[PDB]
């Protein structure tokens, strides 16, 4: 049947390295009373693009 899914299960853990290389800042905004919201204050560091490496 073409309407199911094929579940493959490996022998070898093929690595993958994922990263988000930003130093991001947490800016707290008080939606008072007492409730506080964490926004993206800013981004510092090597502004690469978030990604993942895999041994071809």
């Amino acid at each position, epitope marked *: 049947n073409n309407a199911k899914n094929i579940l493959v299960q490996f022998n070898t853990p093929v690595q993958i390295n994922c990263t988000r290389p930003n130093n991001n800042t947490r800016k707290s905004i008080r939606i008072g009373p007492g409730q506080a919201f964490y926004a993206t204050g800013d981004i510092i560091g*090597d502004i690469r693009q978030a990604h993942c490496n895999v041994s071809k």
Partner: antibody
Amino acid sequence: DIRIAESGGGLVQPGESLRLACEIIELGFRRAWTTWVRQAPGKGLEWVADINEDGSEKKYGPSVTGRFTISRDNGKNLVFLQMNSLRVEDTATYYCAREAYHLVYDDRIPRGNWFDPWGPGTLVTVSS
Amino acid sequence: SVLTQPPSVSGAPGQRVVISCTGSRSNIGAGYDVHWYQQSPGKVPRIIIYGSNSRSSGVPARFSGSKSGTSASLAITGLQAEDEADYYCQSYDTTLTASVFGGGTKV
């Protein structure tokens, strides 16, 4: 923060070694590469030797190529420029700084580096 | 490892002055920035122009760097005695050295 403390010079005669130490306190000591730059008394800029925050990597300038061994105490958080074979040819004063384009590095390759912090420098006069 | 820093920049007080701290394929042709350093007579120099074109604090817009291919030059307008001071550029070498320096320059 940035509170640097230069020291370590000596009033000596040629043919010896000496220990230099910048101290910066109340901040990441192992959180910024620092470098070394002298000034012949009436002359310009002369980079001496670089270091990692951990000192894992170090490179030295041509003038003192492989003659002054730079390193640093990490846990006590001191830097130790063990200069060796001191000679009159290097009569100058010395200064200590570090580079900080860091905030946002927009590349795979850097635009360079800076020299932001300054201080008293040190006194070296190795001669008779 | 020397930048073509003019041994003397000139300009009557208030006049515009320009300094062409240029290098080679290796330093400004290399792709880095001309991190100039302003020095006062008798005082330690400091950063006046980083990023080769960017101002820091306390530096009037009269003072601005620029990098054009293999050339790197600074601009000062309204030059005055508080501005009649030393300037020393420095950047990266692709050939042999870390920190190329110009010869220095004062008014």
